Amino acid sequence: EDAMTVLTPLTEKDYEGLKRVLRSLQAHKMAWPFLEPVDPNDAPDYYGVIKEPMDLATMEERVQRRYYEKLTEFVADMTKIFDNCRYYNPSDSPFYQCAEVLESFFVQKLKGFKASRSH
Ligand SMILES: CC(=O)NCCc1ccc(S(N)(=O)=O)cc1
């Protein structure tokens, strides 16, 4: 990551862009596994093997409360969603596939956001 991403505080204008990025991911057809926390009734061992769970509803709460101070912190929570999924599930599962697709989409949107901060 470049210096602006790591070190520039998130302004109010930056926060309007983060809200838009988040809503775009929540509207994607392959985001269904990630919208809410993993349900322990459907995966009884999940919370014993994933030490730092993350999901898009937790990220929305954090955006609304202005939790993030730097773009790097927002990117780290999003990346945790996809990394947790690829560690828990096998490479041939539909869950793993959805992580591949949605991370590519996130990177496209993140590049757009970064371009809009500066010019
Ligand atoms: C985001 C994410 O990784 N969700 C996985 C949810 C999930 C994984 C596995 C199963 S099982 N035990 O039926 O094979 C159920 C649900």
mmCIF file of C-alpha atoms and ligand atoms in Angstrom:
data_model
loop_
_atom_site.group_PDB
_atom_site.id
_atom_site.type_symbol
_atom_site.label_atom_id
_atom_site.label_comp_id
_atom_site.label_asym_id
_atom_site.label_seq_id
_atom_site.Cartn_x
_atom_site.Cartn_y
_atom_site.Cartn_z
ATOM 1 C CA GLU A 1 0.000 0.000 0.000
ATOM 2 C CA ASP A 2 1.189 3.548 -0.774
ATOM 3 C CA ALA A 3 1.667 6.333 1.821
ATOM 4 C CA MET A 4 -1.736 7.998 1.355
ATOM 5 C CA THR A 5 -3.549 4.701 2.174
ATOM 6 C CA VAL A 6 -1.500 3.968 5.293
ATOM 7 C CA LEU A 7 -1.108 7.491 6.754
ATOM 8 C CA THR A 8 -3.813 9.941 5.597
ATOM 9 C CA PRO A 9 -6.679 10.249 8.135
ATOM 10 C CA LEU A 10 -10.140 9.404 6.836
ATOM 11 C CA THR A 11 -12.133 12.622 6.343
ATOM 12 C CA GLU A 12 -15.948 12.954 6.219
ATOM 13 C CA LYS A 13 -15.765 12.935 2.389
ATOM 14 C CA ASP A 14 -13.679 9.707 2.550
ATOM 15 C CA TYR A 15 -16.421 8.174 4.767
ATOM 16 C CA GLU A 16 -19.129 8.846 2.148
ATOM 17 C CA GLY A 17 -16.971 6.889 -0.347
ATOM 18 C CA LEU A 18 -16.468 4.002 2.124
ATOM 19 C CA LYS A 19 -20.252 3.750 2.617
ATOM 20 C CA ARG A 20 -20.725 3.475 -1.152
ATOM 21 C CA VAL A 21 -18.017 0.760 -1.476
ATOM 22 C CA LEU A 22 -19.618 -1.238 1.325
ATOM 23 C CA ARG A 23 -23.153 -0.999 -0.165
ATOM 24 C CA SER A 24 -21.826 -2.169 -3.562
ATOM 25 C CA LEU A 25 -20.420 -5.338 -1.966
ATOM 26 C CA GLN A 26 -23.635 -5.950 0.049
ATOM 27 C CA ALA A 27 -25.603 -5.792 -3.294
ATOM 28 C CA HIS A 28 -23.319 -8.290 -5.164
ATOM 29 C CA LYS A 29 -24.942 -11.667 -6.052
ATOM 30 C CA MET A 30 -22.028 -13.622 -4.528
ATOM 31 C CA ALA A 31 -22.006 -11.706 -1.178
ATOM 32 C CA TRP A 32 -24.685 -13.911 0.462
ATOM 33 C CA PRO A 33 -22.212 -15.958 2.625
ATOM 34 C CA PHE A 34 -20.691 -12.761 4.122
ATOM 35 C CA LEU A 35 -23.675 -10.465 4.883
ATOM 36 C CA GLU A 36 -24.030 -11.514 8.556
ATOM 37 C CA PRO A 37 -21.865 -13.377 11.114
ATOM 38 C CA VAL A 38 -21.431 -17.134 10.533
ATOM 39 C CA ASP A 39 -24.281 -19.035 12.266
ATOM 40 C CA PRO A 40 -22.810 -21.497 14.826
ATOM 41 C CA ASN A 41 -25.813 -23.879 14.367
ATOM 42 C CA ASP A 42 -24.730 -24.430 10.711
ATOM 43 C CA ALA A 43 -20.974 -24.753 11.535
ATOM 44 C CA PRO A 44 -20.527 -25.899 15.193
ATOM 45 C CA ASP A 45 -16.675 -25.852 15.042
ATOM 46 C CA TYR A 46 -16.292 -22.504 13.187
ATOM 47 C CA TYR A 47 -15.603 -20.251 16.213
ATOM 48 C CA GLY A 48 -13.033 -22.703 17.647
ATOM 49 C CA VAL A 49 -10.838 -22.518 14.509
ATOM 50 C CA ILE A 50 -11.340 -18.885 13.276
ATOM 51 C CA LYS A 51 -9.805 -16.585 15.887
ATOM 52 C CA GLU A 52 -10.947 -13.186 14.451
ATOM 53 C CA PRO A 53 -14.324 -13.561 12.637
ATOM 54 C CA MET A 54 -15.564 -10.734 10.374
ATOM 55 C CA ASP A 55 -18.644 -10.014 8.217
ATOM 56 C CA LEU A 56 -20.193 -7.127 6.246
ATOM 57 C CA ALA A 57 -22.815 -6.215 8.938
ATOM 58 C CA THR A 58 -20.039 -5.792 11.560
ATOM 59 C CA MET A 59 -18.173 -3.586 9.028
ATOM 60 C CA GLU A 60 -21.355 -1.499 8.473
ATOM 61 C CA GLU A 61 -21.703 -0.931 12.247
ATOM 62 C CA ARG A 62 -18.016 0.131 12.368
ATOM 63 C CA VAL A 63 -18.409 2.533 9.391
ATOM 64 C CA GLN A 64 -21.520 4.131 10.962
ATOM 65 C CA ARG A 65 -19.653 4.632 14.303
ATOM 66 C CA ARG A 66 -16.516 6.043 12.528
ATOM 67 C CA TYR A 67 -14.337 3.215 13.939
ATOM 68 C CA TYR A 68 -11.755 3.387 11.118
ATOM 69 C CA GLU A 69 -9.093 6.156 11.246
ATOM 70 C CA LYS A 70 -7.024 5.072 8.200
ATOM 71 C CA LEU A 71 -7.932 3.310 4.918
ATOM 72 C CA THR A 72 -5.511 0.468 5.765
ATOM 73 C CA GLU A 73 -7.710 -0.487 8.767
ATOM 74 C CA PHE A 74 -10.864 -0.756 6.574
ATOM 75 C CA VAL A 75 -8.939 -2.844 3.987
ATOM 76 C CA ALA A 76 -7.634 -5.140 6.795
ATOM 77 C CA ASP A 77 -11.181 -5.943 8.095
ATOM 78 C CA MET A 78 -12.417 -6.623 4.512
ATOM 79 C CA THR A 79 -9.419 -8.855 3.762
ATOM 80 C CA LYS A 80 -10.134 -10.842 6.964
ATOM 81 C CA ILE A 81 -13.591 -11.789 5.596
ATOM 82 C CA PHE A 82 -11.998 -13.413 2.513
ATOM 83 C CA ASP A 83 -8.941 -14.931 4.261
ATOM 84 C CA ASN A 84 -11.113 -16.520 7.005
ATOM 85 C CA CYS A 85 -13.304 -18.091 4.278
ATOM 86 C CA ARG A 86 -10.379 -19.540 2.280
ATOM 87 C CA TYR A 87 -8.815 -20.999 5.492
ATOM 88 C CA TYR A 88 -12.030 -22.601 6.833
ATOM 89 C CA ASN A 89 -13.448 -24.028 3.566
ATOM 90 C CA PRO A 90 -11.838 -26.281 0.903
ATOM 91 C CA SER A 91 -10.813 -24.853 -2.486
ATOM 92 C CA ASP A 92 -13.656 -26.679 -4.339
ATOM 93 C CA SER A 93 -16.494 -25.358 -2.107
ATOM 94 C CA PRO A 94 -18.959 -22.654 -3.286
ATOM 95 C CA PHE A 95 -18.006 -20.570 -0.197
ATOM 96 C CA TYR A 96 -14.344 -20.451 -1.332
ATOM 97 C CA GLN A 97 -15.483 -19.551 -4.902
ATOM 98 C CA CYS A 98 -17.580 -16.632 -3.571
ATOM 99 C CA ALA A 99 -14.530 -15.271 -1.680
ATOM 100 C CA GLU A 100 -12.478 -15.327 -4.941
ATOM 101 C CA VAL A 101 -15.188 -13.411 -6.873
ATOM 102 C CA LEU A 102 -16.036 -10.875 -4.183
ATOM 103 C CA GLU A 103 -12.379 -10.059 -3.375
ATOM 104 C CA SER A 104 -11.732 -9.281 -7.100
ATOM 105 C CA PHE A 105 -14.796 -6.990 -7.073
ATOM 106 C CA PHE A 106 -13.581 -5.290 -3.860
ATOM 107 C CA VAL A 107 -10.175 -4.589 -5.452
ATOM 108 C CA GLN A 108 -11.896 -2.956 -8.484
ATOM 109 C CA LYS A 109 -14.003 -0.725 -6.189
ATOM 110 C CA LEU A 110 -11.040 0.053 -3.868
ATOM 111 C CA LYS A 111 -8.938 1.283 -6.849
ATOM 112 C CA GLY A 112 -11.873 3.557 -7.796
ATOM 113 C CA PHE A 113 -12.086 4.938 -4.239
ATOM 114 C CA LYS A 114 -8.328 5.643 -4.085
ATOM 115 C CA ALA A 115 -8.436 7.517 -7.417
ATOM 116 C CA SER A 116 -11.336 9.703 -6.146
ATOM 117 C CA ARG A 117 -9.520 10.790 -2.918
ATOM 118 C CA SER A 118 -6.679 12.657 -4.651
ATOM 119 C CA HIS A 119 -8.006 14.217 -7.907
HETATM 120 C C1 LIG B 1 -18.350 -17.273 5.379
HETATM 121 C C2 LIG B 1 -18.173 -18.747 5.563
HETATM 122 O O1 LIG B 1 -17.060 -19.270 5.524
HETATM 123 N N1 LIG B 1 -19.284 -19.467 5.767
HETATM 124 C C3 LIG B 1 -19.274 -20.917 5.908
HETATM 125 C C4 LIG B 1 -20.578 -21.445 6.468
HETATM 126 C C5 LIG B 1 -20.698 -22.955 6.496
HETATM 127 C C6 LIG B 1 -19.618 -23.795 6.250
HETATM 128 C C7 LIG B 1 -19.750 -25.172 6.288
HETATM 129 C C8 LIG B 1 -20.983 -25.732 6.575
HETATM 130 S S1 LIG B 1 -21.165 -27.487 6.631
HETATM 131 N N2 LIG B 1 -20.804 -27.981 8.112
HETATM 132 O O2 LIG B 1 -22.548 -27.790 6.411
HETATM 133 O O3 LIG B 1 -20.186 -28.052 5.750
HETATM 134 C C9 LIG B 1 -22.073 -24.916 6.829
HETATM 135 C C10 LIG B 1 -21.920 -23.543 6.788
#
